[PDB]
Amino acid sequence: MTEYKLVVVGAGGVGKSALTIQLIQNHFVDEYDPTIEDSYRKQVVIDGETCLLDILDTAGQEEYSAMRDQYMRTGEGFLCVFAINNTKSFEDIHQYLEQIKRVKDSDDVPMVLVGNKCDLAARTVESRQAQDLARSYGIPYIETSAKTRQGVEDAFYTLVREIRQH
Numbered sequence: 001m002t003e004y005k006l007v008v009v010g011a012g013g014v015g016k017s018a019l020t021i022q023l024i025q026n027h028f029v030d031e032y033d034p035t036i037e038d039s040y041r042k043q044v045v046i047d048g049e050t051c052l053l054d055i056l057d058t059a060g061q062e063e064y065s066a067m068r069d070q071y072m073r074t075g076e077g078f079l080c081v082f083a084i085n086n087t088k089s090f091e092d093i094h095q096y097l098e099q100i101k102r103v104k105d106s107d108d109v110p111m112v113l114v115g116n117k118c119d120l121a122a123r124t125v126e127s128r129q130a131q132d133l134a135r136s137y138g139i140p141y142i143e144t145s146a147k148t149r150q151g152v153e154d155a156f157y158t159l160v161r162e163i164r165q166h
């Protein structure tokens with residue numbers, strides 16, 4: 001059984017915890033409890049192989065930025081999340097991509113760019129703007145809604161695939 005170390009990163013409140021908890025426990029967390037650092041594990045079949053998903057749900061609050069170097073060293077693939085109704089979170093995710101590369105000394109780190117909260121109509125980040133950012137890093141872009149489950153499995157299983165094929 002192959003184990004995959006997934007890490008979910010991004011700015012405060014973009015929905016990292018809601019995304020992970022939707023994938024693992026199949027319900028939507030409506031309240032907003034800011035995360036320090038939580039771990040989840042789950043056995044799943046992906047392309048006919050049983051996998052162990054080890055998911056790290058990380059802090060978006062700038063307070064805990066010191067914890068970053070460690071978890072980027074350890075993790076194998078990174079789900080990099082912004083919210084489509086938060087332009088600043090899109091500008092911020094760019095800074096996360098550079099840190100992952102820097103910390104891991106590699107321009108080829110398995111990553112997926114995720115535009116979350118796509119159920120909301122107050123969009124300020126157009127899909128094409130995020131596509132352009134993902135293209136310059138050579139990584140996929142997938143929109144999600146933790147609330148409706150749209151794209152949630154697609155995003156996480158795509159990241160597994162990127163790790164697998166690394």
Ligand SMILES: Nc1nc2c(ncn2[C@@H]2O[C@H](COP(=O)(O)OP(=O)(O)NP(=O)(O)O)[C@@H](O)[C@H]2O)c(=O)[nH]1
Pocket residue numbers: 010011012013014015016017018019029030031032033034035036058059060061116117118119120144145146147148
């Ligand atoms: N409509 C909608 N709301 C969402 C979605 N994802 C998260 N939210 C809401 O946004 C708030 C923040 O979500 P949360 O998962 O805690 O974000 P976070 O990125 O983990 N925050 P932190 O970095 O502080 O730990 C919650 O009220 C949650 O219900 C989504 O896809 N759609």
Ligand SMILES: [Ca+2]
Pocket residue numbers: 027028029030
């Ligand atoms: Ca709920």
Ligand SMILES: [Mg+2]
Pocket residue numbers: 016017018033034035057058
């Ligand atoms: Mg959280």
Ligand SMILES: [Mg+2]
Pocket residue numbers: 124
């Ligand atoms: Mg604009």
